[PDB]
PDB file of C-alpha atoms and ligand atoms in Angstrom:
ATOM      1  CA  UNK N  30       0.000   0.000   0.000  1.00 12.42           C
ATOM      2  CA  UNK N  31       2.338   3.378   1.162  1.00  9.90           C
ATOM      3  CA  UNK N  32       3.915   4.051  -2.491  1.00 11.93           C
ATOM      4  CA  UNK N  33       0.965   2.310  -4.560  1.00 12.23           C
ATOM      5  CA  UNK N  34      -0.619   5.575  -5.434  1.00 17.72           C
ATOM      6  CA  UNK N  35      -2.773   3.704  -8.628  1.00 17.50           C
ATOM      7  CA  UNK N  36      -3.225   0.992  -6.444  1.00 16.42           C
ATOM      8  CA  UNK N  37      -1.873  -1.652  -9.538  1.00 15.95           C
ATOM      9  CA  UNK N  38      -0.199  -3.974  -6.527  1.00 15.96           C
ATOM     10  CA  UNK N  39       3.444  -2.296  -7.253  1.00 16.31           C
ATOM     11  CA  UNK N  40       5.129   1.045  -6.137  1.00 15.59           C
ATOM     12  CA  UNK N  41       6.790   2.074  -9.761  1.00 13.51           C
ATOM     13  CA  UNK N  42       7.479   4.850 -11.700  1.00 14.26           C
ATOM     14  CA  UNK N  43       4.042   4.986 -13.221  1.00 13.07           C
ATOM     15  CA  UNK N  44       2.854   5.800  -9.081  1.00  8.39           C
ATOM     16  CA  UNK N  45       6.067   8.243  -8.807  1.00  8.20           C
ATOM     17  CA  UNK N  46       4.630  10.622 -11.803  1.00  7.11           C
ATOM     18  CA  UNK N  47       1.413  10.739 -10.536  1.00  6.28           C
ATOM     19  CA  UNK N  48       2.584  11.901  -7.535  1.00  8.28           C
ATOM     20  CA  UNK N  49       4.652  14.409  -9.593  1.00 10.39           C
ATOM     21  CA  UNK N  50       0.874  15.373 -11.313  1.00 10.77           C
ATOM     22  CA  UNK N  51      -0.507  15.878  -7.801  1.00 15.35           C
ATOM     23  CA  UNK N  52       2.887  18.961  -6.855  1.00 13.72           C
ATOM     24  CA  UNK N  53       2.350  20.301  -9.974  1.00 13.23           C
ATOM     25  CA  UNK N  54      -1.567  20.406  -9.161  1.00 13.65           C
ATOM     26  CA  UNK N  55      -2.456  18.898 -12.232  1.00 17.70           C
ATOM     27  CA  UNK N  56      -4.498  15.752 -10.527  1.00 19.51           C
ATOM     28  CA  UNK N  57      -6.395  16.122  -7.661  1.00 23.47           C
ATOM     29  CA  UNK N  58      -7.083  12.809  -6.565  1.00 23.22           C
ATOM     30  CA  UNK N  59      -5.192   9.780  -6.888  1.00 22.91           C
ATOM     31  CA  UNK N  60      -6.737   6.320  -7.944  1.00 22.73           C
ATOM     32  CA  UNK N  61      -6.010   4.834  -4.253  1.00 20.42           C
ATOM     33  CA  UNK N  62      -8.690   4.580  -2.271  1.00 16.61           C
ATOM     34  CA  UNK N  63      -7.200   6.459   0.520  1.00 16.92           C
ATOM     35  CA  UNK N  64      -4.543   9.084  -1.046  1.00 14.24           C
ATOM     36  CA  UNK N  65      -2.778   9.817   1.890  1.00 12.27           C
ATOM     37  CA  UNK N  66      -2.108   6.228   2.939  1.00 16.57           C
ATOM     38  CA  UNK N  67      -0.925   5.803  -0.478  1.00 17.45           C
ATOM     39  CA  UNK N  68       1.213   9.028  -1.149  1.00 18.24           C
ATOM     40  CA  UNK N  69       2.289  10.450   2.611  1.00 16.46           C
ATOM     41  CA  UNK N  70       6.387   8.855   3.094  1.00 14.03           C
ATOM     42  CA  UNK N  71       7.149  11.065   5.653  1.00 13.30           C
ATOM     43  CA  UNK N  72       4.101  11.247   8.052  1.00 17.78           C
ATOM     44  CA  UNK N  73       2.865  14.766   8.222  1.00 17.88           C
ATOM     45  CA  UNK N  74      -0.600  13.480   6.752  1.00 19.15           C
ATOM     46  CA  UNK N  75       0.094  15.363   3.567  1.00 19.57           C
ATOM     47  CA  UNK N  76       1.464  14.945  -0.031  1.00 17.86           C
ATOM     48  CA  UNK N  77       3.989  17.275  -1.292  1.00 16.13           C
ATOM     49  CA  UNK N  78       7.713  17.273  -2.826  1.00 17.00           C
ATOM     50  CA  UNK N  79       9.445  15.367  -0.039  1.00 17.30           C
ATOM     51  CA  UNK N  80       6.724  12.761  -0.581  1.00 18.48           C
ATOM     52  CA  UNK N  81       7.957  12.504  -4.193  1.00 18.60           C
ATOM     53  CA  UNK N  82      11.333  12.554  -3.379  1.00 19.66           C
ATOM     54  CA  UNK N  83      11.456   9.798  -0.788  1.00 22.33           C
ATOM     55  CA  UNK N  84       9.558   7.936  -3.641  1.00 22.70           C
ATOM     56  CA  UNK N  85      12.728   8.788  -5.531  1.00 24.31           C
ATOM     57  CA  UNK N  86      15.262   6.961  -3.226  1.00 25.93           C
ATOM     58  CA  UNK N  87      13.164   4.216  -2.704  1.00 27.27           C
ATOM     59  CA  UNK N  88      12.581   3.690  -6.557  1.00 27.94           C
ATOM     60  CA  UNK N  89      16.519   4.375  -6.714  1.00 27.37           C
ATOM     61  CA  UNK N  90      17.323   1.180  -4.037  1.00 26.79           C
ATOM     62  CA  UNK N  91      18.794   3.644  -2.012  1.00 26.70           C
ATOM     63  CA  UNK N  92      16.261   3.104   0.800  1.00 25.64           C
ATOM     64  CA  UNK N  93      14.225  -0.061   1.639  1.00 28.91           C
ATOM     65  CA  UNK N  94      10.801   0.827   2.835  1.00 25.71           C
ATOM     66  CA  UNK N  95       9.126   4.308   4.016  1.00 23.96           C
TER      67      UNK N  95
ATOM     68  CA  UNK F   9       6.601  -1.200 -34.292  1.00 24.15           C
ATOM     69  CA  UNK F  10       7.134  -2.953 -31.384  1.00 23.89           C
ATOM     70  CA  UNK F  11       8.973  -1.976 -27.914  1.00 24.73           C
ATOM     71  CA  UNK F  12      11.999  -3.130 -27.088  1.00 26.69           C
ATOM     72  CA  UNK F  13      14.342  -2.649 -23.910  1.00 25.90           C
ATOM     73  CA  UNK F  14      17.624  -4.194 -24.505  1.00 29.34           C
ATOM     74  CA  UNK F  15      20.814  -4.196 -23.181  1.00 27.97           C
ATOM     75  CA  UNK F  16      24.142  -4.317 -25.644  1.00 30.77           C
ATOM     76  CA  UNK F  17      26.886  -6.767 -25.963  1.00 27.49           C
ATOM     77  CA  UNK F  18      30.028  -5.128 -26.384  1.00 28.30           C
ATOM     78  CA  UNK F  19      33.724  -6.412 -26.789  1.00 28.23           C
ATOM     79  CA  UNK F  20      36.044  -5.433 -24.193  1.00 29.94           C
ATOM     80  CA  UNK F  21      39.657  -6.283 -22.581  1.00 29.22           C
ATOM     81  CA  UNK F  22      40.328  -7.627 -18.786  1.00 26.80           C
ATOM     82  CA  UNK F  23      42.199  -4.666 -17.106  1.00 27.15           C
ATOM     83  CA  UNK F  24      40.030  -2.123 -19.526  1.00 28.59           C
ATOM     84  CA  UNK F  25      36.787   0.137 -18.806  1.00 30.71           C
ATOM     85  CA  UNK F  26      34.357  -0.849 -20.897  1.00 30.44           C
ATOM     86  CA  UNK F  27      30.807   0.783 -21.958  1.00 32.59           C
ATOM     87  CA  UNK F  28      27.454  -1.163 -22.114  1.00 30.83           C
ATOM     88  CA  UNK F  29      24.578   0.939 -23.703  1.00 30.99           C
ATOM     89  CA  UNK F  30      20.667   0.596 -22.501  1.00 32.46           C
ATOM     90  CA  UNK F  31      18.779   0.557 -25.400  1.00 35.27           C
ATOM     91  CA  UNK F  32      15.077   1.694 -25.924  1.00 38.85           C
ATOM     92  CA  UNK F  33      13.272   1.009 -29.897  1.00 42.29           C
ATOM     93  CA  UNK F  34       9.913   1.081 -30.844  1.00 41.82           C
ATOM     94  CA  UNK F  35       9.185   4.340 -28.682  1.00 41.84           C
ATOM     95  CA  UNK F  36       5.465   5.267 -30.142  1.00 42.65           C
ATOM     96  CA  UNK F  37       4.191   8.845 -30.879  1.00 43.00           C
ATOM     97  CA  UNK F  38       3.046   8.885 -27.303  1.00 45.54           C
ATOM     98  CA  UNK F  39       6.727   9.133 -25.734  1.00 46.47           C
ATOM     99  CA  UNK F  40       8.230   7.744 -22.954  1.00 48.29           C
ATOM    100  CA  UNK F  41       7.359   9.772 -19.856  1.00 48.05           C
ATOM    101  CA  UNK F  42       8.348   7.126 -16.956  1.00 49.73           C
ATOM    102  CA  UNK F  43      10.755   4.470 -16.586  1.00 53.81           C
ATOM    103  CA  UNK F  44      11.652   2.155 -13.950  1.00 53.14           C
ATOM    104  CA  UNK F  45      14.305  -0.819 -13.968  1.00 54.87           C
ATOM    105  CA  UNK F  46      16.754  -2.764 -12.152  1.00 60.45           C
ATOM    106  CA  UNK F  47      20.087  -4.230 -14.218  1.00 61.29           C
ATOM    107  CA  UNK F  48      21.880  -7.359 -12.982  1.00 59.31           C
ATOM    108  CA  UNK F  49      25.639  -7.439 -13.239  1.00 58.61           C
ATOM    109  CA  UNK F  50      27.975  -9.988 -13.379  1.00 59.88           C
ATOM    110  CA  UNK F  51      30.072  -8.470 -10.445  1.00 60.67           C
ATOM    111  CA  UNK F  52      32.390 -11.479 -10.385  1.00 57.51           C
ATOM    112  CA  UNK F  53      34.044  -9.884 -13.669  1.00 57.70           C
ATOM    113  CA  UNK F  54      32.606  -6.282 -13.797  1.00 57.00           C
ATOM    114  CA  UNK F  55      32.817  -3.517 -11.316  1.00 56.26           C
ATOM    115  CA  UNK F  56      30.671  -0.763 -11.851  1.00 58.86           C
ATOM    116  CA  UNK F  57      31.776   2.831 -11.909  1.00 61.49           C
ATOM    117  CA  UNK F  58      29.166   5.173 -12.791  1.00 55.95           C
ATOM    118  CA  UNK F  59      25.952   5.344 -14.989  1.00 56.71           C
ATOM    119  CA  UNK F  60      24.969   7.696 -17.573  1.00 52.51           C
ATOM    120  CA  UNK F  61      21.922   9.287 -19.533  1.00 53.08           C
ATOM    121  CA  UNK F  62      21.982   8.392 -22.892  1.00 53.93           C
ATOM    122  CA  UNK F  63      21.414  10.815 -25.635  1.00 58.38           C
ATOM    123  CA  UNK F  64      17.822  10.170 -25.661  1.00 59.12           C
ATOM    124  CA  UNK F  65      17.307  11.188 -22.540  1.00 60.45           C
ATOM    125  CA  UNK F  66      15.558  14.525 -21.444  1.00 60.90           C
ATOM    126  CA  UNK F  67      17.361  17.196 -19.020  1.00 63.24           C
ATOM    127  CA  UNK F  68      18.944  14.312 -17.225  1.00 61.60           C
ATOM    128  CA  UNK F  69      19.995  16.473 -14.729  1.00 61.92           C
ATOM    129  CA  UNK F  70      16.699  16.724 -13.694  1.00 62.22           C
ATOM    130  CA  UNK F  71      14.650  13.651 -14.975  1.00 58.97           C
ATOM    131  CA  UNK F  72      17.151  10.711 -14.581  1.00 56.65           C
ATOM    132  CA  UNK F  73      19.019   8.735 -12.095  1.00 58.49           C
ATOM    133  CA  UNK F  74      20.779   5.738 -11.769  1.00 56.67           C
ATOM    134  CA  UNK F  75      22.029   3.999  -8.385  1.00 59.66           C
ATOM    135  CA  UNK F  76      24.243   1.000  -7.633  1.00 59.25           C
ATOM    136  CA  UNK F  77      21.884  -0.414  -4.929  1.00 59.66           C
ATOM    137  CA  UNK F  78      24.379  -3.508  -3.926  1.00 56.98           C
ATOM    138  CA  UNK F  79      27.131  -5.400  -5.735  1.00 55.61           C
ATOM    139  CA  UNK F  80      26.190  -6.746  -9.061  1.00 59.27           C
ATOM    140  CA  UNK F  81      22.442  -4.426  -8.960  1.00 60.62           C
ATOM    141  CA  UNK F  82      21.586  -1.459 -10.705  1.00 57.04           C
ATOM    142  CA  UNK F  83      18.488   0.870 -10.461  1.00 55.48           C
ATOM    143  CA  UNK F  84      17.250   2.853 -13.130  1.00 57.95           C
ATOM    144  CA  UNK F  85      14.634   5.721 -13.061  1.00 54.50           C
ATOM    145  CA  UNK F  86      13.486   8.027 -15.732  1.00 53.45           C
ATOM    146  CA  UNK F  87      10.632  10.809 -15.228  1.00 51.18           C
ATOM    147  CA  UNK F  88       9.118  14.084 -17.420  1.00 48.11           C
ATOM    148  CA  UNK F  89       9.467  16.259 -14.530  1.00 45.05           C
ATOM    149  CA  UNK F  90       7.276  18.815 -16.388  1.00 44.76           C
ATOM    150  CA  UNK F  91       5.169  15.819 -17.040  1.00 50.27           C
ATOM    151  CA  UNK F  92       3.952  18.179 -20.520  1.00 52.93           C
ATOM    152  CA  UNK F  93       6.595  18.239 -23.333  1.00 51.06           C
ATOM    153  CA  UNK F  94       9.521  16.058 -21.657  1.00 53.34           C
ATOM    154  CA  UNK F  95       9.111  12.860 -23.072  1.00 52.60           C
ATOM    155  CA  UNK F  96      11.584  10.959 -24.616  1.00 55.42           C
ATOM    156  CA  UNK F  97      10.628  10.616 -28.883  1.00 56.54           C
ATOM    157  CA  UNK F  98      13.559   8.992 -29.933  1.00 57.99           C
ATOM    158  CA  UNK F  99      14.800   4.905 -30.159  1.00 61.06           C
ATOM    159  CA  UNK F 100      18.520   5.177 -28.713  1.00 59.19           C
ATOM    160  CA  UNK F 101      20.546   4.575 -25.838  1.00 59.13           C
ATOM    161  CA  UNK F 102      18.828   5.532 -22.785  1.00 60.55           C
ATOM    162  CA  UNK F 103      21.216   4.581 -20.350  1.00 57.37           C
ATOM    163  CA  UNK F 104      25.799   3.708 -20.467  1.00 54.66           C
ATOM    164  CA  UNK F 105      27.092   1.810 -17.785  1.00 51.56           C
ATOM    165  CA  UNK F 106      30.614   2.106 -17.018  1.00 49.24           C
ATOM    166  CA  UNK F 107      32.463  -0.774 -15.868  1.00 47.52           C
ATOM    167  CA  UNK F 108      36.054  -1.881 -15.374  1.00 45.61           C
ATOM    168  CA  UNK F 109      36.575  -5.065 -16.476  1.00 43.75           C
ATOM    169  CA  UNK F 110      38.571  -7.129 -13.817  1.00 44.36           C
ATOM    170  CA  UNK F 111      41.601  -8.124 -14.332  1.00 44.38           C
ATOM    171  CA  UNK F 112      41.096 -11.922 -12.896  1.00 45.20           C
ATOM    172  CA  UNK F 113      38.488 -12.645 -15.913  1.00 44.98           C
ATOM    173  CA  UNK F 114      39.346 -15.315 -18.264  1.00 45.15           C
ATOM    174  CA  UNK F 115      39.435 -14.265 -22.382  1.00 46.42           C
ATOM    175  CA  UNK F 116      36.657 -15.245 -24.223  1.00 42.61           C
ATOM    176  CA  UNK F 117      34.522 -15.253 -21.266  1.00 40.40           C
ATOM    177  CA  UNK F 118      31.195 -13.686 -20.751  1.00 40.38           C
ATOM    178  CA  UNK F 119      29.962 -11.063 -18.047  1.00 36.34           C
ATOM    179  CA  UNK F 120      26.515 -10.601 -18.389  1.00 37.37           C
ATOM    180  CA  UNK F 121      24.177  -8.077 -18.048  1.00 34.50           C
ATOM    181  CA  UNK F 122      20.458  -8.237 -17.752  1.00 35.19           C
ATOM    182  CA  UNK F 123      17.212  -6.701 -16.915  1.00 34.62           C
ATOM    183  CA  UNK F 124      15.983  -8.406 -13.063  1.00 34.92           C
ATOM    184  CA  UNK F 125      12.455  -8.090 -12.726  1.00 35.60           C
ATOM    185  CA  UNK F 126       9.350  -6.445 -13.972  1.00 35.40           C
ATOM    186  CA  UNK F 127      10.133  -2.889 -15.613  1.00 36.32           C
ATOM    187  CA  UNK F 128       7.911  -0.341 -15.971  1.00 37.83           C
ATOM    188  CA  UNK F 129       7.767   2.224 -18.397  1.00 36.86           C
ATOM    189  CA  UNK F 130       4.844   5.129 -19.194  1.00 34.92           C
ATOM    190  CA  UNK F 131       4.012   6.819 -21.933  1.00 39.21           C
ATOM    191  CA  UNK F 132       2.667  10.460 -22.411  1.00 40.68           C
ATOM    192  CA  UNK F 133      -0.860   9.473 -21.094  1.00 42.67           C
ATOM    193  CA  UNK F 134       1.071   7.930 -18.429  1.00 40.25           C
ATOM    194  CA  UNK F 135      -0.451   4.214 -19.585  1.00 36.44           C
ATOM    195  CA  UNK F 136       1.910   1.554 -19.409  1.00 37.78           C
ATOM    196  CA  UNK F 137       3.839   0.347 -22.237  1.00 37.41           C
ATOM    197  CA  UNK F 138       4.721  -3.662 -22.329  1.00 36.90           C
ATOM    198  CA  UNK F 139       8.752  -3.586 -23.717  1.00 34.77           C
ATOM    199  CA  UNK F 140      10.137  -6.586 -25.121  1.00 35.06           C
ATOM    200  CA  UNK F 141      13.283  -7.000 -23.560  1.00 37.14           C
ATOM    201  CA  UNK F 142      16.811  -8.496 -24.782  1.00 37.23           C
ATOM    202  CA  UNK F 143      19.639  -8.742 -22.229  1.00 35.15           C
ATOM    203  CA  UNK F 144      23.151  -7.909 -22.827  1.00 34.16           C
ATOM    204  CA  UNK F 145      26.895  -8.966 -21.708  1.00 37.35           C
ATOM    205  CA  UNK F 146      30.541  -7.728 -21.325  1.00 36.58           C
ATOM    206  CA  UNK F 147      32.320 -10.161 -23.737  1.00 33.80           C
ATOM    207  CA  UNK F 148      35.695 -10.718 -22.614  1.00 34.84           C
ATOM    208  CA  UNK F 149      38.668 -10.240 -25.470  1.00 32.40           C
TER     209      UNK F 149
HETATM  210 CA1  LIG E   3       1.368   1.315  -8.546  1.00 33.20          CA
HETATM  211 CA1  LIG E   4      -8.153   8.674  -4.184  1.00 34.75          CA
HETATM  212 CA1  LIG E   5       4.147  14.015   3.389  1.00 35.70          CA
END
């Protein structure tokens, strides 16, 4: 679930540009059921660029889970 | 035309840096917006210096990275940070890996190199777009 933003079963790249649609303001809701279970990394029960770039090291290997 | 992610195989020396180009054909009027991968290694032979956007690639600065997550495993992302006219249009290299070819590996061998796992890319509409892929190797000269 946290990553899984189109709720398709994997946390991909696909999931990391729609969050990058949601910063820009360009989608308003994502396709998960709950958005901020899906998109919130860090905890502040919000989505915004540190969401998306914690996305980034975790698509990247460089971290393991959120 | 159909989509292809492959990786090269390329000649190279033990002792020498070699380059293996990340290939993407078949890219459809509709772009490539996303990409996600992971590349195998064979780290017995190879060990990896540094990764680099190929010339398709759109301000790589921004849109691209590449990370050695542990020995022998590479992950690949790709995004249209404008998500609006930063696609990528053209078949090419999308990604070089830099090795150096250890000096221990036998002539004639084979390192390989290979796609691990599902990738994912997106296109403009940000719909997914099935690539055929065709791994690669380091052939030792
Ligand atoms: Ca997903
Ligand atoms: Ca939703
Ligand atoms: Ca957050």
């Amino acid at each position: 679930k946290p990553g899984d933003v189109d709720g398709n079963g994997s946390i991909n790249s696909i999931d990391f540009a729609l969050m990058r649609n949601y910063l820009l303001g360009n989608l308003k809701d994502f396709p998960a059921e709950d958005d901020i279970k899906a998109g919130d990394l860090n905890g502040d029960k919000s989505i915004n660029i540190n969401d998306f770039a914690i996305m980034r090291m975790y698509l990247l290997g460089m971290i393991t889970k959120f | 035309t159909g989509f292809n992610l492959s990786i090269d195989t390329v000649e190279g020396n033990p002792g020498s840096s070699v380059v293996v180009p990340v290939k993407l054909s078949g890219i459809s009027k509709n772009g490539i917006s996303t990409a996600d991968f992971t590349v195998t290694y064979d780290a017995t032979k190879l060990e990896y210096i540094s990764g680099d956007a190929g010339s398709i690639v759109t301000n790589p600065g921004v849109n691209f990275g590449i990370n050695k997550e542990s020995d022998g495993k590479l992950k690949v992302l790709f995004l249209d940070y404008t998500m609006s006219t930063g696609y990528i249009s053209t078949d090419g290299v999308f990604a070089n890996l830099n090795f150096n070819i250890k000096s221990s590996a036998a002539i004639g061998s084979k390192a390989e190199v290979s796609i691990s796992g599902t990738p994912t890319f997106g296109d403009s509409t940000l719909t997914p777009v099935v690539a055929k892929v065709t791994n690669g190797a380091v052939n030792l000269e």
